[PDB]
């Protein structure tokens, strides 16, 4: 990924590692329901 | 992509500056002007003179010398400068000088009107001649040579010295700053 | 790497003048650095310059007199006709005949004033005020 230190800050945010992990799970589901099912 | 006739007056960059407003209010009462438009028209006349003078300071010969001469002889002809004048004097000039070269103002002077507002009415109702010609435009800038030929019209009751308003106006023979 | 000894020389003069040094040394000398200093002397911005000779490109010793505010190279050596010096003045100088733009011409390295009175343009290479 391209990332943003701004996003790494926490003032009004959730942690970026975990945002990232969520994004990747979504992407996996989408990829999964796209190509074969 | 054609010509598109453009205004010959410039409006101010901000409409609500207290300094400019006060100054213009005073000028408009002194010279009896209907419109800021009219005032700004004369201001723009001045500005264009000034810009030409600037360019010709920062210009070079064989042309921009012609235009120097033309500017100076135009301003002489209008009565804004003397014949021995220069571009420095152009930059010294003022909108008040222009407005003083209006017809309304010269008729408030030349003891013809008793008031700039009555001068306006005389001009507009057709009682002023300039070189034999009726002029009805009070914003007409008089030339320094036409100034001494200003007079009531021959077909004007004010040209009859028995006229009441003529009698009042000459009861108060006054001039000077206008 | 090294590029434009002239710009380096002028920047050195500028910085040394800021700190009040009386003499500077310009190490990769050139005929152009020398002409520019000839002009700067003639228009009274520096004092006295002398070419020291090593085995290398030679050095210039330059005695200053406290009459420089900003001296610099116009490095895109700009072609300038004989009737554009007004604009380049307005870009590089603070008042109408204040400093000096140095112009390389076919008739030598000159000031824009001399270029104007000769009716010849050229390429701008430096300014000094």
């Amino acid at each position: 990924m391209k990332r943003r230190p701004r996003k790494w800050k926490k003032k009004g945010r959730m942690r970026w590692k975990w945002i990232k992990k969520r994004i990747r799970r979504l992407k996996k589901q989408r990829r999964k329901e796209r190509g074969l099912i | 992509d054609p010509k598109r006739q453009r205004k010959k007056y410039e409006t101010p960059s901000h409409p609500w500056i207290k300094e400019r407003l006060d100054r213009e209010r005073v000028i408009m009462r002194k010279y009896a002007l209907k419109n800021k438009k009219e005032l700004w028209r004369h201001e723009t006349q001045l500005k264009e003179f000034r810009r030409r003078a600037r360019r010709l300071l920062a210009a070079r010969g064989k042309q921009a010398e012609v235009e120097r001469v033309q500017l100076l002889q135009r301003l002489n002809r209008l009565g804004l400068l003397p014949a021995d004048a220069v571009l420095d004097d152009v930059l010294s000039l003022t909108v008040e000088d222009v407005l003083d070269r209006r017809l309304q103002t010269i008729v408030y002077k030349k003891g013809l009107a008793r008031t700039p507002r009555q001068a306006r009415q005389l001009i507009v109702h057709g009682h002023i001649e300039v070189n034999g010609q009726i002029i009805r435009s009070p914003g007409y800038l008089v030339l320094k040579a036409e100034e001494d030929t200003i007079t009531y019209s021959k077909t004007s009751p004010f040209a009859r010295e028995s006229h009441p308003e003529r009698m009042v106006i000459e009861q108060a023979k006054q001039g000077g700053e206008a | 790497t090294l590029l434009d000894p002239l710009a380096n020389a002028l920047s050195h003069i500028t910085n040394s003048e800021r700190v009040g040094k009386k003499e500077v040394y310009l190490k990769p000398a050139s005929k152009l650095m020398g002409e520019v200093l000839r002009v700067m002397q003639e228009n009274g911005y520096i004092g006295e310059f002398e070419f020291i000779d090593d085995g290398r490109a030679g050095i210039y010793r330059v005695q200053l007199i406290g009459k420089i505010n900003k001296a610099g190279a116009i490095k895109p050596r700009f072609p300038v006709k004989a009737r554009e010096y007004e604009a380049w003045e307005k870009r590089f100088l603070p008042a109408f005949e204040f400093g000096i733009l140095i112009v390389s011409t076919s008739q030598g390295v000159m000031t824009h004033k001399e270029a104007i009175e000769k009716g010849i343009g050229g390429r701008l290479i430096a300014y000094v005020y």
Binding site: - | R50, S92 | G66, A95, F96
Partner: protein, 220 residues
Amino acid sequence: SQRVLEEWEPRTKLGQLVKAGQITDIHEIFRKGYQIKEPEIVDVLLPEVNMRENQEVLDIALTVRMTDSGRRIRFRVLAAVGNRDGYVGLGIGHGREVGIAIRKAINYAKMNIIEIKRGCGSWECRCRRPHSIPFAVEGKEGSVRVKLMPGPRGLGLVIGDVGKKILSLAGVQDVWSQSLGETRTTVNFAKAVFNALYNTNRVAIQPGMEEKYGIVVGRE
């Protein structure tokens, strides 16, 4: 001025001289390293500075200090004074009330008085008379980067209101400006203009440029 001079006892070496009739001109005051701690000195040698006109208040800010028991407010006042020839000063003053702050700001302004160069250096006037500055000049304070350029006669002051005020008090009638930074910071804008007007002195010249640019260091 005799009026303040009577009431005034000097407290300083400079004030002693001024009272004593020595140092009769503000030009003799300045370029000597001297220490001005007395608006009375400045008023004596430059009495037009005592005038409500020729004084200008340029900004009033209510600044806050927090405490237990809440907010304690102070008033910062940016004022300028000047003789409309070539002398101007700029001061900040603080108070619990605006009037205290104002009189303090004006005192500090008279202490921060400076002397400027005036002239004509524009390509399109060359009138050799001191309506503008004689050469472009730059000044800064904070993020503000003020670059003043000479203008032609009758142009006016092409600058924000703060610069208009300061330059009017300094006797500059015509000027062009280019600015960078936050000019909505009045303090730093004003100080930038002020510092530019001092850099008029910092700039060097050649012999004939005085005559050709009409350079004038104080009164004309």
